[PDB]
């Protein structure tokens, strides 16, 4: 149904220094992420989609 | 090795928020900021240094 991202370590990592950088998973917005991160193929959908499961993880 | 961990002007919004939650930068506590903030890999250390800046500073 869904086609989902592989998020690496390094890729995740990026996104975390994304997210601490605009203040955190509460502040951050997905589309502050992609502009910060400037990954080759990365899209709003997919940092959205990680933004909110990483919210849920804590 | 390891990031540095920067007080960028977003980090530092958030942080400005939390110390006047609890009552102004000589009243809020390194971890009362650190709790609010919910920041992953943030320390007290890195709160604690900021905020004695804070307390130093002439404005909010």
Known sequence: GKARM??????????????????????????????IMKVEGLTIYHVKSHLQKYRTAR
């Open 6 to 35: 592989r998020w690496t370590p390094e890729l995740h990592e990026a996104f975390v220094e994304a997210v601490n950088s605009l203040g955190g998973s509460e502040r951050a917005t997905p589309k502050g992420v992609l502009k």
